[PDB]
């Protein structure tokens, strides 16, 4: 929990067969059965509780260059069967650059990695803020205007005062608002409250570094874009890229087909306290980051509905796959009772979706 220093090189164990891209702040539930993996975690509890999770760019090959450290915040040991099943919940803390990968004789990998720094740049107007305007730069915090506000009125006055010194430079006030941490966070909050209706600033972070990594976990994005967001070091550039994904990549197609649209941004809504996307676990320890959508297209139901291990109690799940390539995309959830609203919804796994630009001919910018 004390966090590692920036640019410091750490030798930490990479947990085997964890082929995923962990993001700082993201929770990682894991179920371990091998005594070698369990004893490694048992020894990590006696130390800083930090292990490594590699971001493998290639699935078949071990092309891993970046990763994220994971601190074990909760330990749980079960002896229900002859196998000591140990379930642990970890949380991502810092990104890293892979310097060396040492496979030990016991199969556990040891990674000497460099902790990457978070690029915290000052305000653009700090270089041109006049000494006479330094005194009136701070905005007055008051419940009469900063809360129960018009939003249209307050953000206009915020831009005028913060970026008043834009007259000295070769660019307008509104251009500086496009590279402003608070304005970009506000624009993401607007688009995020549409999906997560019962959301408030008490849950989302205030800091832009912590906010950007939280947004990357919430966004239904494939492993390609998830690596690209972690490659971006500056939070302003990361928020600009995340917000461009939200505006341009509004269509969510099947990853195998690429041209078979399953759902769109407007269909995203929430039925869990975590948000629209939540990391659920099946009876065999597999984690599925399922997106909660109102309606889904090009999906066929295989098998009969079931109630065992239903993630949404009082809803019968049915296996759903792509009508074109038969690849598993998710599960359709139908209500058992008549008054239970929504009447029907779909839980689509993240690994099976691919965010695409609507059918027309653009790159995602930072």
């Amino acid at each position: 929990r004390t966090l590692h220093d920036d640019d410091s090189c750490q030798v930490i164990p990479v947990l085997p067969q964890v082929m995923m891209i962990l993001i700082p702040g993201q929770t990682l539930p894991l179920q371990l059965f091998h005594p070698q993996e369990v004893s490694m975690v048992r020894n990590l509890i006696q130390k800083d509780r930090t292990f490594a999770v590699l971001a493998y760019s290639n699935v078949q090959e071990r092309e891993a260059q970046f990763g994220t450290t994971a601190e074990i915040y909760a330990y749980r040991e079960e002896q229900d069967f002859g196998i000591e099943i140990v379930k642990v919940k970890a949380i991502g803390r810092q990104r890293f650059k892979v310097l060396e990968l040492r496979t030990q004789s016991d199969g556990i990998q040891q990674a000497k990695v460099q902790i990457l720094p978070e690029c915290v740049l000052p305000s653009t107007m700090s270089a041109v803020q006049l000494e006479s305007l330094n005194k009136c730069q701070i905005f007055p915090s008051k419940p009469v205007s900063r809360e129960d506000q018009c939003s249209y009125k307050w953000w206009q006055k915020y831009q005028k005062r913060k970026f008043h010194c834009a007259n000295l430079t070769s660019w307008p006030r509104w251009l500086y608002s496009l590279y402003d941490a608070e304005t970009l966070m506000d624009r993401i909050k607007k688009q995020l409250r549409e999906w997560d209706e019962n959301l408030k600033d008490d849950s989302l972070p205030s800091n832009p570094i912590d906010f950007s990594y939280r947004v990357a976990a919430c966004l239904p994005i494939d492993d390609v874009l998830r690596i690209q967001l972690l490659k971006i070091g500056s939070a302003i550039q990361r928020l600009r890229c995340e917000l461009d994904i939200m505006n341009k990549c509004t269509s969510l197609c099947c990853k195998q087909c690429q041209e078979t649209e399953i759902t769109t941004k407007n269909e995203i809504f929430s039925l869990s306290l975590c948000g629209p996307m939540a990391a659920y676990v099946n009876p065999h320890g597999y984690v599925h980051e399922t997106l909660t959508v109102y309606k889904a297209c090009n999906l066929n139901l295989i098998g009969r509905p079931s109630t065992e291990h239903s993630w949404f109690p009082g809803y019968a799940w049915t296996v759903a796959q792509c009508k074109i390539c038969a690849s598993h995309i998710g599960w359709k959830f139908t209500a058992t009772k008549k008054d239970m609203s929504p009447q029907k919804f779909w839980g689509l796994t993240r690994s099976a979706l691919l965010p695409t630009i609507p059918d027309t001919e653009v790159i995602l910018c930072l």
Partner: protein
């Protein structure tokens, strides 16, 4: 490897601070001015100001205050630079030799710190016993002014208040006290703390009043007999002294925020208050009769004296003459004609001093066709707007006041006129429409128009294209743009098989609901027979930030796209090719078929137009995240830029690279802390056309015009060793190393300078005396390599001065 030479053609003219006292002598009244890196010393006379000495300091003067320790005959000056270089200087003249000695020096940057939002504040105790510097939130630094404190040993007292707005040492205090306005989620409050040098704890002060104005931003220590402090927000002026708390809300000050102040009388009876619109008010403190209580303020009064330049700082001198240290426009000595009946007091400007800052955009022209280049700049902002014509012949400068913000500028040789994009602020009128605040270049044009295309009190920004004559500088035409249309770029060039030269304007439809510009247009205009004509119009789905003539075709940046238009025989902008990139294309510069694209976060790339392909090929990328202001192509391999805390950098294309990764990556081969914020770069020279090649001029916010030129490795290594020898001989002001000042600086890191030669330090070789010249050229080699003589290197430095 790239090697460059940066020399200052025009020193920074903008004034960021001014102070008065007795620096040269107790019997001489002085006016010391800080023009960013320079310090000017003047003697107050009935003839205005007599120049005494201008010194070149290696640092941005952030704090500048005068104080006289007990025993000292004359005042000493404290200067703290942007890089926290604190120092105390003394004026010393023996006959004719004027030299500014360094009594005390040091770097007061803490090992770990949270820089405050209200900048760096530096205040001195009235009895000259300590220097309170509020650099970081929660830590108030105290430097005791002891006899043997040459290295300025400092200690921080733990302050509980983090979001402190402004602090000043109060007067009428037996024990030193500091009054301050701080903000917390509950509101803005006033609190005093007694500063203890012995216990190093903030003891309970004499008083602390809560619930002050929401915009309370300024604090003024009132001297004896009045005592206490004056707090000024936007709509009210208050005075606090424990038992007394006066508060006045005159309607003459509610229209603008008061941002600067200065004391007129040493006792504190009269004060000057300047606002954002350049208005000057007089704050009077009426004293009531004494039984034994001379510490009684009867009432406060505010009287609008008149309109002056947009004042960054003010300074009362004598006979009603006030120096107005303006940062946006010309600084000026104004006379206050209060000597009538005290009812009708009016201002009369008496002497204006040229200020070219902020230089927003510029262009190199040759109006007289004499070979020597002339630089016309878009200087000033708001009513201080102007066009300055700089020519070499020591640089002669002509001013053309526009009374509105000039944004961009270009030159059209065929029609003998300049294209100038400009903006004026009109308030939302009582009738529903808009009304101009004052007459300006766009409203007082010989001919004016509004675009015919059709695709309360709130301030509205109105953009217009001005066609200004090259000889008389009269506004011949003022074409106003559409409602909610921001004019961003402007060029004057010939395209396709058309012989006429057109003024092309790129715009962005800015609406408050739209966060990013989703619409804009490129308008082509022809100026013929004294009038501008709308010729072509091409609507685009984005903002047109930059445009450039690229091999007879119009290259334009639209949000995150670099599109190329070819001018058809039907006079229409037909698209040829596009390049969609991961960057918001803000900056566009071209040389032949190569294109340099840049972002506000230093995310840059280089494309190349291939006629065989008929599309752009991405050559190289370099995504180091850091703020930017301007870029320029030096040559096919070297590219110059300006980043975050007043730095200059050069990225080079690795041509000798073997792999695609190394060829597609630009290596950072140059770094230099310039100390100025560069807004524009322009190829050209003021001198008629050597060890140099290329001539890239630059305009800055502080009004400084510089020049960058490429040098060979032999000239670079010669001037680098000569620079180190000059640095170790020249007495720097405030004992600040040249290596530290020019070392690249950001809030994250401070790395040494590379690939750049400080031309100002190289030119100082001719200013040093002959015994010191022999000390510098000793053991230095010059090319067969032989021992360099003083005479041979004097000719080399003289050739470097001949370029500007």
């Amino acid at each position: 490897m790239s090697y460059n030479y940066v020399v200052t053609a025009q020193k920074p003219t903008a004034v960021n601070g001014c102070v008065t006292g007795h620096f040269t002598s107790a019997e001489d009244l002085n006016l010391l001015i800080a023009k960013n890196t320079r310090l000017e010393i003047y003697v107050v006379t009935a003839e205005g100001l007599r120049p005494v000495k201008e010194v070149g300091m290696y640092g941005k003067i952030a704090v500048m205050e005068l104080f006289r320790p007990k025993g000292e005959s004359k005042d000493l000056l404290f200067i703290l630079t942007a890089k926290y270089n604190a120092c105390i200087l003394e004026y010393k003249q023996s006959g004719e030799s004027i030299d500014i000695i360094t009594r005390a020096h040091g770097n007061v940057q803490d090992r770990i710190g949270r820089p405050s939002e209200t900048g760096i504040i530096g205040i001195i105790d009235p009895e000259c016993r300590m220097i309170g510097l509020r650099l970081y939130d929660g830590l108030f630094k105290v430097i005791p002014l002891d006899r043997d404190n040459k290295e300025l040993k400092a200690f921080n007292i733990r302050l509980e208040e983090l979001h402190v707005i402004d602090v000043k040492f109060l007067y009428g205090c037996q024990a030193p006290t500091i009054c301050f306005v701080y903000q917390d989620p509950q509101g803005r409050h006033v609190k005093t703390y007694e500063v203890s040098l012995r216990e190093k704890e903030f003891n309970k002060g004499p008083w602390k009043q809560e619930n002050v104005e929401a915009e309370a931003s300024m604090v003024i220590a009132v001297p004896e007999p009045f005592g206490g402090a004056i707090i000024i927000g936007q709509e009210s002026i208050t005075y606090h002294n424990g038992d007394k708390y006066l508060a006045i809300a005159p309607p003459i000050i509610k229209q603008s925020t008061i941002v600067c102040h200065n004391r007129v009388d040493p006792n504190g009876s009269r004060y000057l208050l300047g606002d954002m619109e350049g208005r000057l008010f007089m704050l009077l403190l009426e004293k009531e009769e004494q039984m034994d209580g001379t510490v009684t303020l009867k009432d406060l009064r505010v009287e609008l004296l008149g309109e002056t330049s947009i004042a960054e700082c003010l300074t009362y001198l004598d006979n009603g003459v006030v120096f107005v240290g303006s940062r946006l426009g010309d600084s000026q000595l104004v006379k206050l004609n209060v000597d009538s009946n005290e009812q009708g007091s009016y201002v009369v400007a008496m002497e204006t001093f040229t200020n070219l800052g902020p230089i927003v955009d510029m262009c190199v022209v040759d109006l007289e066709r004499q070979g020597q280049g002339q630089l016309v700049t878009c200087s000033g902002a708001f009513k201080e707007g102007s066009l300055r014509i700089i020519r070499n012949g020591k640089l002669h400068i002509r001013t053309v006041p526009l009374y509105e913000s000039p944004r961009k500028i270009c030159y059209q040789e065929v029609s003998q006129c300049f294209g100038v994009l400009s903006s004026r602020i009109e308030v939302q009128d009582t009738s529903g429409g808009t009304t101009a605040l004052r007459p300006s270049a766009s409203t007082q044009a010989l001919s004016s128009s509004v675009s015919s295309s059709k695709l309360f009190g709130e301030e509205v920004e109105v953009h217009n294209l001005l066609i200004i004559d090259q000889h008389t500088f009269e506004v011949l035409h003022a074409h106003q743009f559409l409602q909610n249309e921001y004019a961003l770029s402007l060029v004057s060039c010939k395209l396709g098989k058309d012989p006429n030269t057109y003024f092309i304007v790129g715009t962005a439809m800015v609406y408050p609901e739209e966060a990013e510009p989703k619409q804009g247009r490129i308008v082509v205009f022809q100026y013929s027979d004294g009038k501008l004509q709308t010729v072509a119009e091409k609507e685009v789905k984005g903002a047109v930030y930059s445009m450039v003539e690229f091999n007879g075709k119009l290259l334009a940046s639209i949000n995150s796209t670099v599109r190329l238009y070819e001018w058809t025989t039907e006079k229409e902008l037909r698209t040829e090719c596009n390049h969609y990139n991961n960057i918001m294309a803000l900056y566009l510069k071209t040389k032949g078929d190569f294109i340099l694209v840049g972002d506000l976060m230093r995310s840059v790339l280089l494309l190349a137009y291939k006629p065989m392909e008929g599309n752009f090929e991405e050559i190289a990328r370099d995504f180091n995240p850091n703020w930017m202001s301007a870029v320029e192509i030096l040559d096919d391999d070297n590219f110059l830029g300006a980043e975050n805390a007043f730095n200059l950098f050069v990225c080079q294309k690795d041509s000798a690279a073997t792999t695609d990764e190394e060829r597609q990556h630009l290596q950072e081969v140059g770094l230099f802390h310039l100390g100025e914020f560069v807004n524009v770069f322009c190829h050209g020279s003021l001198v008629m056309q050597t060890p140099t090649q290329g001539s890239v001029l630059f305009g800055t916010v502080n009004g400084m015009i510089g020049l960058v030129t490429s040098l060979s490795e032999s000239w670079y290594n010669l001037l680098l060793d000569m620079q180190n020898r000059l640095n170790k001989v020249i007495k720097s002001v405030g004992k600040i190393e040249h290596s530290f000042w020019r070392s690249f600086h950001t809030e994250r890191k401070t790395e040494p300078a590379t690939g750049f030669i400080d031309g100002d330090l190289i030119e100082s070789f001719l200013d040093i005396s002959r015994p010191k010249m022999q000390e510098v050229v000793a053991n230095l080699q010059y090319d067969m390599k032989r021992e360099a003589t003083a005479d041979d290197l004097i000719k080399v430095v003289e050739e470097l001065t001949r370029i500007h």
